[PDB]
Amino acid sequence: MTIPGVNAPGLVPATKKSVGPKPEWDSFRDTSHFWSSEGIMNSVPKV
Amino acid sequence: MSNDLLKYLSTAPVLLTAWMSITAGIIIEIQRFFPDSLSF
Amino acid sequence: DVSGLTPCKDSAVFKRRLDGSVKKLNSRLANYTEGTPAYIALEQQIEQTKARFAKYGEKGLLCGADGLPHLIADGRLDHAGEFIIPGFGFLYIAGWIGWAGRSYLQFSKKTDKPNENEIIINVPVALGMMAGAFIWPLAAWKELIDGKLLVPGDEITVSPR
Amino acid sequence: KVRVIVDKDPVATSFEKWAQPGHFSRTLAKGPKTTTWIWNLHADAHDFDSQTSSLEDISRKIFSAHFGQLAIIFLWVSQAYFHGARFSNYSAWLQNPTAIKPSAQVVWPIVGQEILNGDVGGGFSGVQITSGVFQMWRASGITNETELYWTAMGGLVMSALMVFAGWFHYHKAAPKLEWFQNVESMMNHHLAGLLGLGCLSWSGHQIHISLPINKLLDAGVAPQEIPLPHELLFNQDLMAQLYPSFKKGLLPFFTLNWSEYSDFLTFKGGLNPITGSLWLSDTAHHHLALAVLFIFAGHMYRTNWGIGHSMKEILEAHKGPLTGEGHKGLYEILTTSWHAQLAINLAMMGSLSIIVAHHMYAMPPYPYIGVDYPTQLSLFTHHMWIGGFCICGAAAHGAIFMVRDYSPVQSYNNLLDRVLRHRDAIISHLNWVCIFLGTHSFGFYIHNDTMRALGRPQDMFSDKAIQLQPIFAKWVQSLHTLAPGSTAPNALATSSYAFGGDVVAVNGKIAMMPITLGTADFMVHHIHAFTIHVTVLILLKGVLFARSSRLIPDKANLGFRFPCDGPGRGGTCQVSAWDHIFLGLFWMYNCISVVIFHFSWKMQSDVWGTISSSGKISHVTGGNFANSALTINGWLRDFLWSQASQVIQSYGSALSAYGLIFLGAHFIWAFSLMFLFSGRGYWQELIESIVWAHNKLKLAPAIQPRALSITQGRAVGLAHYLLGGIGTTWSFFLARIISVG
Amino acid sequence: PVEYSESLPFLVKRKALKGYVGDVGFDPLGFSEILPMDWLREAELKHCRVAMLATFGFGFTDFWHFPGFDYTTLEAHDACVASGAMSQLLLWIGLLEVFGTIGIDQTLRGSGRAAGDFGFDPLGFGSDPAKMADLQMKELANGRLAMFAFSGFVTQSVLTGNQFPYLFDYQTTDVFAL
Amino acid sequence: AIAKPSNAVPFLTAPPCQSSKLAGAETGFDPLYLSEFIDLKWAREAELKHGRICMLAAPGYFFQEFFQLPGFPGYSPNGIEAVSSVSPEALAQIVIFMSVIEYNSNLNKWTMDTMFADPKREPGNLGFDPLKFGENKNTRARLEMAELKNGRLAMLAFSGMVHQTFVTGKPVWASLQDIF
């Protein structure tokens, strides 16, 4: 395991995704956990 | 919660329902983990 | 061997039953595609069926002409696990339950309000009685020897004969 | 003046009376001395009129109890929608309704019960449902599961709101009896406000969301490419592309050019050929017209302003020579007594449920519900049973009103008094009607059985030996078939195809077909009449003789439900109106069982089936009703024995649950006969012996055990009898119809 | 004498909000009349504190993350639910919230505990009673700001697809132009 | 403004165990208030018994990977497959030894009332002190508190060892050294 601090960096910088064009409302609505048929099924606890 | 609600939960039907639900859960989980045991 | 029965390991009818069950599931299996929840669930069903049949064969149960296990309950220790061991287990559990009930009744009567103690259980002491009933065979014997298990005969109502 | 007046904080929120079980009743508040106390607790739980004496408190309790019931109903609607969303093949069924079997329940694999997850199509394994909710949602326009999920969450929110309202309207702000007794305002709001605006809103929903989605689905657009309801709601261009009249806007409504909306507001009648169900445009027009009717109706009764009627004067004005004072005092009776209102409302609710059953099968309202034979049978039978139960509740609460809230001072010489004063004539004439009707109707069957057994078919009451034709039913059917041309010119097709016309069919299966009536229909209808008449005899005798009788002049003093008045006068067993209800529940059970058996056999023999390309019609049983329904032997052989095969042969399959429930229902029905035949004295003596056995081991309880009361033994026997019978028929019908259809 | 709200001076004061911190009278919809103030204020402080932690954590995870967790802020929840590191938060926060529901039960029954007081003050900030009222008001102010802050963070992040500022691409130029 | 706050959870009322004389009472840790319901002496008798069993178990579990009883059959370095592989008639004899000790120590006193029917009989004072450390009453409180704390730590430690072995499939020390 990568113990953060001793055998790994304490905090890694996050991926800067760069400023760009916006997404589409349909694009991030047909993947939401409450307004997508498959998103609802992917929101059930796996367990 | 309070002495009153604890007494109500200690009433006979609530206790029977809780205890029989616990017993049914024990039996069901035993069946899940040791299924189809016709004999010892 | 007893009563003309044979073990389920060398039971052609038992094997035929196993193959029939397996073939029935695998048929029902045709409706669903690979990798789906229903497909994997039916695969679990087939595995559990095969495991059950293998376990029944290994356990030494006797299979009759109909090809189903037959339990022998006469006292022979070759088939103790069928009735004798489960029998003692149930007897212990049932005596546990009865002893917990009896001891709680003995407590609840001494209370100032036994009628309300029966319908509103004093759970803190009731759990104590349930725990203490684990040693009921010795407790029952001790109470019998001390004359506290049985109420005498003329202290119990009896109707006009 | 009609106004809102409430009491602030009338009751404190505390668990002390949760801990105290019998707080509500004066007798039970002391505590238990016998096990009868436990039973009396549940028996008198919701008897507010016996618990208290204040009509205000009774009304407040009833109002908040109604809120609790509404919360439970909302949770139930939530369960339906959520299970459809999560554990159902609704998407597959929507893509292919004819081939896919609707299913919205999945069992876990624990003890090998996973076999119940049968093959329902669409790569889904579960228990087939028969509630019609899939067709309901298709009519409503739901095409995806997110919609089902969100309406389920909304239902949960509504259930929580109802629980909060029930708490608030009893513990924080409870109304007054003056508020409760504003019946005129209540009727105005329920006609114009509840029913009228409910119909108006449903019509708007239909016109805006259901017609476009359903028309596109029938055209062939798959659910994925259907425009969403929020798009369809405001996109008038798409609505104009679908229905051209939408481009004209609301000006043809505000000006009285209502004919411009003829495309989406139709009077076509009949059934849609595609879905084999009622036209949704017709349904929208129907609900809109009803909204107008109810909003018009709800402005009748008086309120804070001068205009309006008063039910008191309306009743008091209706009196005739043969009725004395007429309806005087009934307004006071129905404003003071909740039991009278409960009686009337239960009677109407039950009769309305029966009417719903009779109408839904004949005019399938939801798409692809006619071909779904399990759904039709299940809904018809369910609503018939609910109707019978509600009617007997009506009789019971009428009897309760007679026992408790009746008083001659208010009813001196009104219709209630005049009815009580010749109850003997009423009951004797109904008794003669029952004997005559039953003798003739069942003697037709017995005569037919005797002639068949003697080998004399020429002497039967058959369609070809001695015809008993229903000439009036046939005449009415002919009139309804000719109606669309002559007496309903603007209607294009018949109201129902049962009267006559074409044979509506979707794919191979037949959705609706004309139902022909003959000798067997005559016999079974007169059997229905006899059963209804005997049930009315029992219930009406119980209601009329609730006060007293020639046997017990002071029956009202004993109470509503009491065991007897001793073995004197030869025996006064079951003299109570409660016992009359107990006896009438058996008779409505018999009535509804015969009705559902008639429905099942008639529809499988003569309507349901498949139609081939050449026009050959093949029915499930093969039209054997017309010739085998003439004898009790034919009823026993060709219906019970013949159709029990699908139930008894169900083991090892998905219907194994139906087989198990069949056996269990038989067991419970048999178990009930113990309580129905036995008596309390035997069981009390047996309990005495068992109590001796326990006392010998020093474990006899402080709460002494007792045999059940006589009324309780009757109630337990009746409940087990009804549960066993209804469960037997439930399993039998469901297994048979799911297997064959 | 009639009491008017200091935030809605066209309405009469509720009279149920007396003796509480941050009492400008903002309650047009009358929740205090129905629900108890102790329950409402415990909920307010819980939302305030969770929202402060959430708005700090969202921005922090937009910049830095532990070596094992290589997910962005949006997919972090799903990735960590799959990994099992959200169950480890729900178990150790659910323990805390079991103790919390015992506490709110006690204070609603009248134990003596305040609405949101857990006594958690290790470093001694505000141990003087004079500073405690001011710090309570400042806590409420910062938390009620952080609620809107986190709401804007999540909504603008999903709406824009940009990492820290949650601003459209055109908003990083010519936003002060005549 | 709690009148009698708990010394451990100061936003909760004092439990009954806090105002008692058993050892370790001040912490006052009882969020669920189980001391009000359960008999307090009976629970110290259970606490001490569990802690003693667990603080025999945890060193045993942790050192059975390193060491073997010379010549013992069925040995495995990890306790779970060790108990799976060891002959049943050794575990049976261990259980019989424990049962004999329990029965003879608790003769005629197995119920909440029968045990502690005697006022002298203290929670967990079974009388096992061959070396007589208890005669010195100056350090009795120190030793009692140390026994209680060590037993509790041993319960948690044994639980952790067993569940870490379930997670990893490897013994305690191997699982620990494969982290760093």
Ligand code: CLA
């Ligand atoms: C709007 C509906 C309605 C309302 C508000 C009432 C209200 C009332 N009825 Mg009821 N009643 C109704 C419908 C209604 N009834 C119907 C439909 C019938 C016909 C069957 C009756 C017949 C009837 C009689 C004959 C009597 C009442 C009585 C009462 C009063 C007391 C009831 C009580 O406390 O029960 C509390 C609840 C119970 C005791 C539980 C009942 C459980 C039933 C019997 C079985 C449920 C089975 C379940 C659904 C399925 C089990 C499945 C299995 C596999 C486990 C109360 C005023 C009694 C009275 O004295 O009135 C003044 C009375 O004697 N009612």
Ligand code: CLA
């Ligand atoms: C098959 C079983 C059975 C039968 C035959 C009857 C018969 C009757 N019940 Mg019912 N009843 C039953 C079960 C049955 N009951 C059960 C299980 C219960 C308990 C819930 C009740 C409870 C009950 C009550 C509470 C009441 C009835 C009533 C009646 C009578 C209805 C009037 C009628 O049509 O009479 C005509 C006779 C029949 C329908 C029987 C068969 C007739 C055949 C066709 C022959 C008739 C011709 C001729 C005269 C005789 C044949 C020749 C002969 C000389 C050889 C009738 C005597 C009601 C009553 O008395 O109303 C007046 C009534 O109040 N019953």
Ligand code: CLA
């Ligand atoms: C909860 C306690 C516990 C339990 C249930 C077991 C169970 C087991 N151990 Mg043991 N073990 C324990 C504690 C325990 N151990 C302790 C504390 C140690 C010392 C580190 C060991 C060291 C140990 C080894 C080295 C081995 C086992 C092994 C075994 C297995 C076979 C039995 C055996 O050979 O025991 C051997 C028992 C011992 C060597 C000594 C036990 C110490 C007892 C419990 C102390 C109690 C007495 C007390 C201190 C004396 C008071 C004196 C006073 C009068 C003055 C079995 C699974 C074998 C194995 O690995 O099989 C897979 C094996 O080889 N154990």
Ligand SMILES: CC1=C(C#C/C(C)=C/C=C/C(C)=C/C=C/C=C(C)/C=C/C=C(C)/C=C/[C@@]23O[C@]2(C)C[C@@H](O)CC3(C)C)C(C)(C)C[C@H](O)C1
């Ligand atoms: C304050 C408050 C409340 C609250 C709160 C909230 C929301 C608190 C949130 C706290 C939070 C968010 C705490 C995270 C901790 C994360 C840790 C310790 C991570 C360990 C990580 C470890 C040990 C390892 C990670 C790994 O990557 C490593 C290093 C190596 C990789 O190979 C893989 C693995 C996975 C092994 C209440 C209770 C709701 C109400 C009350 O009123 C007020």
Ligand code: SF4
């Ligand atoms: S059995 Fe019951 S109803 Fe019949 S006479 Fe005796 S007491 Fe009366």
